[PDB]
Ligand binder design. Sequence first.
Ligand SMILES: Nc1ncnc2c1ncn2[C@@H]1O[C@H](COP(=O)(O)OP(=O)(O)OP(O)(O)=S)[C@@H](O)[C@H]1O
Ligand SMILES: Nc1ncnc2c1ncn2[C@@H]1O[C@H](COP(=O)(O)OP(=O)(O)O)[C@@H](O)[C@H]1O
Ligand SMILES: [Mg+2]
Ligand SMILES: [Mg+2]
Ligand SMILES: [Zn+2]
Lengths: 193, 637, 438, 172, 200
Amino acid sequence: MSLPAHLQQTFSPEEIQFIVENEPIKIFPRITTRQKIRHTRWQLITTDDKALNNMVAMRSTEVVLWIALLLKQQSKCSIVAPQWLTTKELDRKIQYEKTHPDRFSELPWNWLVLARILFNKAKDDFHDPIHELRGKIQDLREIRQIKVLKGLKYLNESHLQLDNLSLLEINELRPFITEIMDKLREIHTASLT
Amino acid sequence: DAVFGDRVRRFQEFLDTFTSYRDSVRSIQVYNSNNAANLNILPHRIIISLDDLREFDRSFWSGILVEPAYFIPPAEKALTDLADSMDDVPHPNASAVSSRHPWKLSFKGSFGAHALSPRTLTAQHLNKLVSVEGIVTKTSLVRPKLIRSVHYAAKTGRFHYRDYTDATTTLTTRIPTPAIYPTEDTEGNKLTTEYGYSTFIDHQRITVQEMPEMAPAGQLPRSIDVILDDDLVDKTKPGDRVNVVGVFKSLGAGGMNQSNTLIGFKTLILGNTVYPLHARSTGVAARQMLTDFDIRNINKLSKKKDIFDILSQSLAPSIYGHDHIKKAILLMLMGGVEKNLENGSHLRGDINILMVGDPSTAKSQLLRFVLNTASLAIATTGRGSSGVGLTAAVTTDRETGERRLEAGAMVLADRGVVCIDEFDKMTDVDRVAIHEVMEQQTVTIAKAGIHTTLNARCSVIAAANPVFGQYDVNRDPHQNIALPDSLLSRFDLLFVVTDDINEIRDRSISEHVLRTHRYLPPGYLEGEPVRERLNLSLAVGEDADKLVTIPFLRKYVQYAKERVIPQLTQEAINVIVKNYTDLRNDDNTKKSPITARTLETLIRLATAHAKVRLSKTVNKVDAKVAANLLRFALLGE
Amino acid sequence: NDDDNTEIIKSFKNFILEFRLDSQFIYRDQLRNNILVKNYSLTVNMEHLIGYNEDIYKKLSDEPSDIIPLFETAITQVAKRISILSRALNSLPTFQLILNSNANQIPLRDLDSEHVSKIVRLSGIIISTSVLSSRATYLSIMCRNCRHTTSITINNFNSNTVSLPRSCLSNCGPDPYIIIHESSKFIDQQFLKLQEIPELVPVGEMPRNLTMTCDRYLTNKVIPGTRVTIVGIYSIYNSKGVAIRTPYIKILGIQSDVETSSIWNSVTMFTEEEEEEFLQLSRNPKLYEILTNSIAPSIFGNEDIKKAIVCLLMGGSKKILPDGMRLRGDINVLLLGDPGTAKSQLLKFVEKVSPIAVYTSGKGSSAAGLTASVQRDPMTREFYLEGGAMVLADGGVVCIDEFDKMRDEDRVAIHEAMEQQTISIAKAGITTVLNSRT
Amino acid sequence: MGYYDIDDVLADGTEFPCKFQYDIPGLGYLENNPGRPITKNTKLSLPLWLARILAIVGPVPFVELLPPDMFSTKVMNAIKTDPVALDLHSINSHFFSLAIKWIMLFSEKELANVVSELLLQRAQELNHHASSLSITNIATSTFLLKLEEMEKEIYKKSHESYKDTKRWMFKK
Amino acid sequence: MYGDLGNKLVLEAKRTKQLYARSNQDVNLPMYHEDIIRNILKEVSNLRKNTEYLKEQQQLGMLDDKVAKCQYFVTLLCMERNKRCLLAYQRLRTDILDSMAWNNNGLDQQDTNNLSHQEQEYLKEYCDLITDLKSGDLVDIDLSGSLVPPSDVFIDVRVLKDAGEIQTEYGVFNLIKDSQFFVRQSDVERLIQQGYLQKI
DNA sequence: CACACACT
DNA sequence: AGTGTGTTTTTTTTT
Ligand SMILES: Nc1ncnc2c1ncn2[C@@H]1O[C@H](COP(=O)(O)OP(=O)(O)OP(O)(O)=S)[C@@H](O)[C@H]1O
Ligand SMILES: Nc1ncnc2c1ncn2[C@@H]1O[C@H](COP(=O)(O)OP(=O)(O)O)[C@@H](O)[C@H]1O
Ligand SMILES: [Mg+2]
Ligand SMILES: [Mg+2]
Ligand SMILES: [Zn+2]
């Protein structure tokens, strides 16, 4: 058909992955795209290739995520971990979440997808041991789910608010939440004259 | 007791919330007082539904379920003090005042979350009040329990009351004590035990089993015992579907005394209140309700002559034809008057009909229809039951410890319509036993050490196949059936069913079956599997509480047995005797000399026909109709 | 060592929390599952345990009897850590462990006097199942005169049972702590009996049977007459013959040797896919003849006979009329003909096809109570109702042999039962009626 | 609600008890007896899609509906006792839709309140069940049986999203 | 009772849509249930006949519109219910048609027996319209382009079935049975559409 | 659980 | 004076 029903209801995890790929990211080159004053330019409409024309091996460079992953598949790219990804930041966020059962922590919504992709490919470049990072992010996911559950006790027909919930979790939750919410709205409207 | 007192206060707030309850208690007390002035004193039993009080206090209603052993005790204490502060008639029966009359709490409706079934009952839900409806095979006899001991030495002027609630009635699990009645009391005082003023509660160990059909295939019914102590004593007979509201409790220390140590734990359901519902498909416990609207109904039709035929048509609507047979079974259903005489000779008003039919003549279903139509409905086949077992089993029971009377069908038979199928196959010893005990309607049961005679008066329908596959007219009827005329004459009606087949009638049967088959059951999806579910009946206890509808018809006819008591009327008497003139000495050899039995049979038949008319006495129309139907049956037409 | 035991508990929780494959911690997955549906039970594979840490597995093997309660406590603490907010007895029921071994199975026969209190792997067919028996997870007591009330949490991991408390324990007596059976928390147990490996067929040896016990998330999983591959510790307790005690098994995991799924509660293990191709076969009329031909291999024809067999096995629909009546669904097919014509062979094949009922023979079946026999129980002199063949056949399409050879009189009692689709018994003063859907 | 919705039509088709406040000739075919006309004060189940209009049409409505056992007081009692326990599908495969139509016809807040409460409780339980993922459970299937078909659809979609996620992050 | 026939029809249609929906993969369109359709056709004709009898009914003696016109309006209700049931069934059919067109003719029940003529040319012209959308503008993108986000252009693929050489844009490629081939994503996708490739 | 014996 | 220990034929069912 024009569009499968499941697709129009919610964004697929692969679509989330694509969106995250559209994000920029800090990396290190292993190629000096700069040409000595003493070829072929990338010429991208979606992203300024001037930076892409300007990489030098092992220098500060920011690029969009998907090209970074593409080049990281090759030996020519080195990825930079985010600051929140650092184990100390993870521990602080865990402590915050334990401290504040009411609400969530200001995580970068795409953090789940970022963690997935980096674990898939950037396993090498993690300064911190990767397995502990996996465990910590798993625990954060669990805690966020539990905090959701208490929110489910407080589902309302009027207003639902989510301050710091990640894009992945809100996407996977949207179908059921919207169904329940709109059903409550319809019930109330029928109650009203 | 601070939490206990708080729960007492909350229960008082409940009583304040629902006046009707205190009003019912008020009506109970005045009922107690006037009857005391006059019997039948209802106990201090008070019934409050789970759906009741659920509204004003979610917390209290929940905690009743979660911790009944902590909620009901204070609730009943508050109930009692409210009643005694509100009965306002303390002086009469001052002797029983000291003995004290506990006020009891009951419930209505289905817990659902708590009330599921005996089989579904597991230890995971224990010490919480639940309800299950089940069949009870075992009932223990009553034994009073002396919880409040009255004992007193004349010199003291004290009248000590040492009250002991060891295991059963207690909910706090008070320590066991023997109640020795020390002959020194405290100050060397004789301490005479004063009989009376002492509480006694007749204990019952009653074990309840699940449905055979609800039990999955290959699974024996699950059984659990319940306790009844001079509060709920003996509404129900063994083998009856009954809903009990009980708490899941454990005793015997789980058997973990000192070491074997893997033995199971002793648990049991103690039931505060019980709702007996033994009616088929969860009806009205075979107790048809009555309203003045329903009372005035039907009657106007009873004036019309066709009402009898309408009732006949209503019976076995799934069967085609057999209109005279349906009239006969209708006459069966209505019960005749048991004429009594100032001697051992008591005339029987029971209706007994024997029928012989080809296989698959629907008579089996007919017997089944009589079953599901009758209240008691004691039915089986010739091979279905052991004759001695159904009549009386004089074997001992190990728990009882001595010789026991066990009448499988007989004691169940009396005071209710009963059925028997394939009596030709029935054990001949059972046949000779039923002979003359169904004539005299009483069994001496003098067999073995027990000699007590128990009455067995009931209405019985017999459906035995011919000795040959089908009745052959060339063969004699007694050649066609080997059952001797002994007590075969003692059948108020005799019937022969022959599956002869005619194009018109064959088409009629076929069309009837076609209508019955393609018909989707009431409601449901057309492409929906059969459900025959439990019906999830929330209503429990007082919550449960020209064509004519069938259960409505049954209620009407039961009301008739309750009310219509016709007496043999003189013009009907003359019609009867005028028939009998030639009936006993009929020139036509209809076989089975009618003798004196058939006169009484026709008497009963005319009486029940008058009962159809609802007349307070018999009429000659009843007599002539009965005679016409009898000659119809005897000619075989 | 109690601190050391707590350290071992911590090591086990480190196992479960940090054992993953492909970033997937299956243990927390099943944990959250058992949180969503509140089954306080956990399944673990010892191969995984060895892979993560041999030492913990070895400590397990040394004396599982007391290692298991520590593991249960660890799982309970883990559940408290995960599924309960931080700083937010009997508040959370303890989770119980489930294990799959995949090691060798010593036969029930030839079990040694050794292996006492040792985890073992076996297989056998159930001959009997016990009713549920609660077990005091938590015990509530009070010191009688001293009035001191205390808590006890006894595990079913010793031997037999723990004796009742003695002395005041902060004279109050040799057992002041009278158990108040209200706060005390119980879990049901069920006893099992396995026949020794019907395939083993020890020639001339009567099949030995051992007793078992099951926990609340193990009980009632399987029925008698069904073979199960069991993984439970070898267990010994005193029945009440010197220094000889009852041998039994405390089960840590249950697996079906017959491998047949449990009572089908309409949960589609075939799922939408397999039933979709099932309907496609129903959609294609040729598949009807496919089923026809497939039945009775090597029969060489008789195809309409096989069609009739398929239709009978297919089950006639029982319609319940709004009237007290009810259309009879099942039918019973009659097999008359010359001997040596694979008739009994075909019956056996059909019964093998559909085990909802049981193949029998007339002489082999007891003449009295073919539908349901009445037997005197050893501990109750009353003759109880034992389920006969058509009790088992109820809910199943049943094949029985030698109808002609059978005595006719009781076969008369069969036609009525099948006609009514129930089995009505009032013999011996017992008026039980059981359904016969066969 | 969707006009082309299948459940819309199905719920509309269900017959409901209607008492005839009018005795109008010619409508006997509605009782499959076209020759016999309609008589006054007669109760009769009639399809909901007909029924709600027939209640609407009338001054005094020509035909009056009856309080369904579908909406009997014991129904609400069972709901309030335990929303989870009740097998809604056994009560109806379209109970929620029928309640919606009734409330649009009759704005009873208390019925709306209890319906909302039941829906909420089944919503938490459905979230629990959908979040549970195989790597099936009998209790989940039993719950599925206890649910209305539309509830089953919500569970299907939610569990489908869960499965998509779990297959996504846990494997390439 | 009249819509009851339509009720069975719509129950059948809901069964079909459940059957298709539960399987993410394509479900061959079930046989067109023209039996029930024609039954409803006669019912509506006879329904129209009874409406005419109501008009003639009045012209003669049923002049009590309160009664007669009420009866006619009721008939109208019945016929509208039947019509709406048929519309829902037909719309569901057409949704399946569009789905199958996109999945087979756009991505590349082949038999039309399950399908009636009218809807046969309906689906044919719908496919033509889809091509027209592909035609002219928007030709750059595939109107039936894969809705999955593209993971990696270069992937190795083993040949599912041997079909000889098939020309790509620039590289020769022989479909030798079970041969790995690591190339751009367009060609491998289009051959997956024919299924000649596999395993990703 | 709890009360007569046989020494404790 | 320690402390321990004991009491609740029949009838089917084969055959
Ligand atoms: N038509 C046939 N096709 C294949 N094998 C057949 C056929 N007829 C007979 N047999 C074989 O002959 C054997 C004899 O049948 P049995 O299984 O012993 O039972 P049965 O045919 O009921 O014999 P009776 O009547 O009990 S002595 C079958 O097991 C088949 O192996
Ligand atoms: N007149 C009839 N109308 C409808 N069904 C009939 C009739 N006669 C026999 N049957 C059918 O015959 C079947 C067997 O009847 P059953 O009660 O076993 O016969 P019998 O009278 O020999 O005991 C049933 O399905 C019953 O409905
Ligand atoms: Mg019969
Ligand atoms: Mg044979
Ligand atoms: Zn003490």
